[PDB]
Design a binder for this molecule. Structure first.
Ligand code: MG
Ligand code: MG
Lengths: 138, 138
């Protein structure tokens, strides 16, 4: 499964991809609409999304991601981290973690890695419980 | 299992505990030596440790934590996040993530929560694989 990166600024998006591509299959989208189109057509484990994008915010986009694909791990990149209403929006959206803007490359890589590990572990957990049913009960 | 917090400054340590205690059993230590004593005697899932402490650094302490209890999730709090040698030390230590100093309360809470979830998932994964052996093979 892929990591999907969503950012309206082309150079930030490209640099984020460069940071992760030695470690993950990377998909990129320039805004929420393009990103939803990718989520509908590709298998995505982790979404990293910028908050401030023309039109639809990352918080709104990721709120919908939680609704339609709740097993994804969802990360938001945002400034105004000292804003209690920003923080309350991120929590209400079911976002797993935020990264402070300008995103820190080492921190982004670690978040993507920890996020992918949580995803793998949860998918393996499900598979193991299902295989136990195919062994137990008859 | 508990979250262990390690910080030499008593007020930061107390505030970190206040941030997490509605969500976790919290243990506290004022430096690496006291923290190792706790790890030897209590069941700990997550360790959050300050880097700069009199004598032993968080990086050194957490390096030893990786050796003796590798299934813990380990977080370091550090300044100088723009230092490539700091970053290389954290990576070499097998530390899962860093938080930038002064630690951000919402970010600390999210890291502790994601860390505990990874721990739970990995322990459940092991348990499920073992229970499958008690069903398969005879
Ligand atoms: Mg933007
Ligand atoms: Mg200190």
């Amino acid at each position: 499964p892929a990591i999907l990166l969503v950012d309206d600024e082309p150079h930030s998006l490209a640099a984020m991809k460069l940071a992760l591509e030695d470690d993950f299959d990377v998909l990129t989208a320039q805004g929420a609409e393009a990103a939803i189109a990718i989520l509908e057509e590709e298998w995505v484990q982790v979404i990293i999304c910028d908050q401030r994008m023309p039109g639809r915010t990352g918080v709104d986009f990721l709120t919908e991601v939680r609704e339609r694909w709740p097993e994804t791990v969802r990360i938001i990149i945002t400034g105004y981290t000292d804003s209690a209403s920003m923080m309350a929006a991120i929590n209400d959206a079911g976002i797993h973690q935020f990264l402070t803007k300008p995103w820190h490359p080492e921190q982004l890589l670690s978040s993507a890695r920890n996020a992918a590990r949580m995803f793998t572990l949860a998918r393996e957990n499900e598979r193991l419980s299902l295989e136990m049913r195919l062994l137990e009960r008859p």
